[PDB]
Design a binder for these strands. Structure first.
Ligand SMILES: [Mg+2]
Ligand SMILES: [Mg+2]
Ligand SMILES: [Mg+2]
Ligand SMILES: [Mg+2]
Ligand SMILES: [Zn+2]
Lengths: 37, 115, 111, 217, 261, 69
RNA sequence: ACCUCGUUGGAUCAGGACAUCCCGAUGGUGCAGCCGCUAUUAAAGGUUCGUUUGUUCAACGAUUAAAGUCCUACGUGAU
């Protein structure tokens, strides 16, 4: 994960999910895209 | 027990050990978390204005029973890799060196006498 | 059993460039057999030492404690200490400069 | 009759049952290993099995410079020089791995402790490794070697000339000035040989220990 | 009852006789301490509800003492029990499987060699001690101008809090408090004199009563299978035990001198 | 110079004789080592070192201080 | 709007923060394993000895798993 103030989807498979209280960008294809609010 | 600044006797065939010098060889560092070297511990020596590793093979401090106590703090010069600098050790070497953790087979092979 | 016969057989099988054996008398409180073997290079020394150690580990004597490999960091001299025999692997220059043969055959009759 | 020093207990509040148990173990070990009579100053050869080797014995010959400890842990430290290197080994008498204790030369010295041989000349600690055992007559008092050793220069392991050591086996006249001897006399403590409450009477204890040993036989 | 997993049996109250060496077949020397079980009896039993917890309790005493020097209530208690009074009474937490009738004696063979044990006793009292001896403080240098402070505590707190924290290490009474040594191996048991040879050191002085119980360490959780579960009963006479029970590794005296062949 | 002229030769012969039944070591290396020991030194010593050299050779022949097997 | 210049450590004992130096757990990596780099979490524990310098420091030597950044009226001098 990379901590970002603003979450931006990078590829098509990047999806926003609110988990354990905060927003995340997960991605199956590109785990490099993993972002945490 | 050999600490920093202890003067030590190089019991070895090496030129560094057998070469005369104004300052006697003196322990500079004991490669042990407590700065106390026993038989089998490595130390760093200031010999002839040169820093050389060495191995303790005897000391005046009493150890556990059945082990020999020497009249001097005997040390053997070794290289950084571990090869003994000299090729012959004249004074007796304690046999307790064998089972201690650490490489001592080279020193035992070089040694002439055991006590 | 893992004995000097197994040792020499394994060493000849891996083709040590030179092998010598010394029968240490019992009154000398070190061991029974003093094996000294030369090799082509540090890679060959490491390979043969590893092979003989694996054979010792796999062969027998589960009650016998495991055995170190000494001299790994240095390249020109390795050594392995077993219960009753010690092997010294080295290069020809190391062997000729340390003359372990004269030491271990002539205890106090050399220089 | 010689009672080995380790049998006589140092005084204390320890229960006599502990000493009885320890003496039982000591005698039961002596039934296996013959612990000969010897004194500080007698030359001994000790053969002991080495755990570092595989069932191989090691022999050390030297002059017993100190007897110490009581009970099963009793030790004697004996000294020699090997290739000019002074060495001392403190052997445990009842260690199960001492195969044999041989009194090469049974003799008593002027002192009950020869720790000053460290500061004496190396000849007084040198002993041939292969020296043959001497023989003493069966009915004969143990010889007392009145040898007075010569000392190396004054910096010593201990201030041997001080009266608290009560050393008789050193030639102080050779190495110390009369002024130095007089200065050492400042620590005399003459009352210490006359305070009667300091003496430890072990007659009854030795008698009981002898009864125990004879019963063990 | 037979032994079950999770069962805790009673311990003993022994007397520290002293220490002696011992050797193992590997050639190593272990110092061992002798604990003599002297007139140790189960005195009292209480259930889980009134045990100040949730485990049955056995009060056990040892080292019979003079009736002339005990309080009337203690004398009455021991009169009802039918036993002479004991010097110290210690409470052992047990499961109901291990309940033993009060008055039953306890012996050193209640333990067995190879078992691990916990020994708790009052440590040697050293009186009011300074901080250098009590807590191993470094003190101050002997010279170079140091005056009247060599063994004193330095600062005892920071200036901000304007106070001294509770539990601050300060000079005071050292020792004479109960301490427990855990995981000590039982090397040997003299059944004749009821001696337990326990590995290493035991808190307290010689001839002091120590409380001995099965070790609570997790490694030795279920080693009680082969131990006499309620306790050892010599009256049972199933097999009269030898004079000395040894651990396997112990170099017994009278054995031929060990050779590392 | 040596103890006797034939002592060295007899010792060398006995060394080769006991190398005849050599079992575990390298026979070629053993012979090469003996040749080195007896050729790199025994040409131009002084009359005093000959006794030490032959004594050490005899001790090695005896093999009480460790023998080559 | 010219020049200048206006109480401090150490020792002892440390309390605390985490913005973590090491030890722990994870995500990613322009890391195949080894590794390094980066980020999240983690303050239970630990965090060396010397030479020159009064050094506050700094450099150097030898180590270390690491030789953390700080606050505590130099933290602490009725020690
Ligand atoms: Mg001294
Ligand atoms: Mg001090
Ligand atoms: Mg003062
Ligand atoms: Mg954090
Ligand atoms: Zn993506």
């Amino acid at each position: 994960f990379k901590n970002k103030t603003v979450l931006k989807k990078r590829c098509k498979d990047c999806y926003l999910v609110k988990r354990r209280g905060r927003w995340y960008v997960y991605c199956k294809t590109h785990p490099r895209h993993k972002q945490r609010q | 027990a050999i600490q920093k600044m202890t003067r030590v006797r190089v019991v070895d065939n090496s030129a560094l050990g057998n070469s005369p010098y104004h300052r006697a060889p003196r322990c500079i560092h004991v490669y042990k978390k407590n700065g106390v070297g026993k038989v089998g511990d490595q130390i760093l020596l200031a010999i002839k204005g040169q820093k050389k590793k060495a191995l303790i093979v005897g000391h005046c401090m009493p150890g556990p029973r059945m082990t020999p106590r020497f009249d001097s703090n005997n040390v053997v010069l070794i290289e950084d890799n571990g090869n003994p600098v000299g090729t012959r050790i004249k004074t007796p070497i304690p046999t307790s060196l064998r089972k201690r953790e650490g490489e001592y087979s080279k020193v035992l092979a070089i040694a002439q006498n055991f006590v | 059993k893992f004995d000097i016969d197994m040792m020499v057989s394994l060493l000849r099988q891996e083709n040590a460039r030179d092998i010598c054996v010394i029968q240490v008398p019992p009154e000398m409180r070190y061991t029974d057999y003093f094996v000294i073997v030369s090799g082509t290079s540090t890679r060959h020394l490491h390979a043969m030492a590893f092979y003989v150690v694996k054979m010792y580990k796999h062969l027998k004597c589960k009650r016998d404690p495991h055995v170190k490999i000494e001299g790994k960091d240095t390249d020109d001299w390795l050594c392995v200490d077993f219960g009753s025999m010690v092997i010294h692997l080295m290069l020809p220059e190391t062997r000729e400069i340390y003359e372990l043969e004269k030491l271990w055959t002539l205890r106090s009759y050399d220089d | 009759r010689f009672l080995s020093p380790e049998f006589i207990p140092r005084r204390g509040r320890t229960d006599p049952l502990k000493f009885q148990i320890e003496r039982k173990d000591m005698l039961e070990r002596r039934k296996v290993l013959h612990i000969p009579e010897f004194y500080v100053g007698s030359i001994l050869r000790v053969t002991t099995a080495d755990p570092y080797a595989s069932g191989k014995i090691s022999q050390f010959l030297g002059i017993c410079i100190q007897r110490s400890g009581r009970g099963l842990g009793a030790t004697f430290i004996l000294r020699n020089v090997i290739e000019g290197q002074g060495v001392e080994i403190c052997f445990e008498l009842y260690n199960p791995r001492v195969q044999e204790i041989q009194v090469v030369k049974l003799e008593k010295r002027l002192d009950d402790s020869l720790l000053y041989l460290r500061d004496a000349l190396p000849e007084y600690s040198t002993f041939d490794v292969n020296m043959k055992p001497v023989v003493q007559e069966p009915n004969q008092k143990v010889p007392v070697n009145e040898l007075k050793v010569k000392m190396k220069p004054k910096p010593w392991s201990k201030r041997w000339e001080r009266p608290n050591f009560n050393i008789k086996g050193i030639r102080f006249d050779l190495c110390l000035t009369e002024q130095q001897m007089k200065e050492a006399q400042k620590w005399n403590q003459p009352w210490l040989e006359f305070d009667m409450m300091r003496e430890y009477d072990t007659s009854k204890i030795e008698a009981a220990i002898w009864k125990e040993i004879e019963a063990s036989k | 009852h037979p032994w079950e997993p999770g069962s805790f049996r009673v311990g003993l109250i022994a007397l520290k006789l002293g220490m002696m060496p011992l050797w193992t077949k590997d050639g190593q020397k272990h110092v061992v301490t002798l604990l003599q079980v002297q007139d140790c009896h189960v005195l009292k039993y209480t259930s889980k509800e009134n045990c100040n917890g949730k485990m049955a309790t056995l009060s056990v005493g040892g080292k019979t003492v003079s009736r002339f020097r005990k309080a009337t209530s203690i004398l009455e208690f021991y009169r009802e029990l039918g036993l002479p009074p004991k010097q110290t009474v210690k409470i052992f937490n047990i499961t109901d499987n291990a309940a033993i009738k009060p008055g039953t004696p306890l012996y050193a063979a209640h333990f067995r060699p190879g078992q691990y044990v916990d020994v708790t006793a009052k440590t040697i009292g050293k009186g009011f001690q300074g901080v250098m001896k009590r807590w191993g403080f470094k003190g101050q240098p002997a010279t170079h101008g140091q005056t009247k402070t060599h063994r004193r505590p330095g600062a005892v707190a920071t200036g901000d809090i304007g106070r001294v924290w509770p539990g601050t290490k300060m000079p005071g009474k050292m020792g004479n408090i109960y301490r427990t040594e855990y995981g000590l191996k039982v090397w040997r048991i003299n059944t004749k004199h009821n001696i337990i040879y326990v590995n290493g050191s035991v808190p307290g002085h010689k001839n002091c009563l120590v409380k001995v119980k099965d070790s609570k360490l997790p490694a030795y959780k279920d080693l009680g299978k082969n131990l006499p579960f309620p306790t050892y009963f010599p009256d049972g006479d199933e097999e009269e035990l030898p004079e000395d029970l040894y651990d396997e590794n112990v170099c017994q005296p009278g054995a031929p001198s060990i050779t590392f062949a | 110079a040596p103890w006797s002229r034939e002592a060295v030769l007899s010792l060398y012969r006995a060394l080769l004789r006991q190398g005849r039944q050599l079992r575990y070591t390298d026979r070629d290396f053993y012979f090469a080592s003996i040749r080195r020991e007896f050729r790199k030194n025994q040409k131009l010593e002084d009359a005093e070192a000959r006794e030490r050299q032959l004594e050490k050779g005899l001790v090695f022949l005896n093999g009480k201080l460790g023998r080559i097997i």
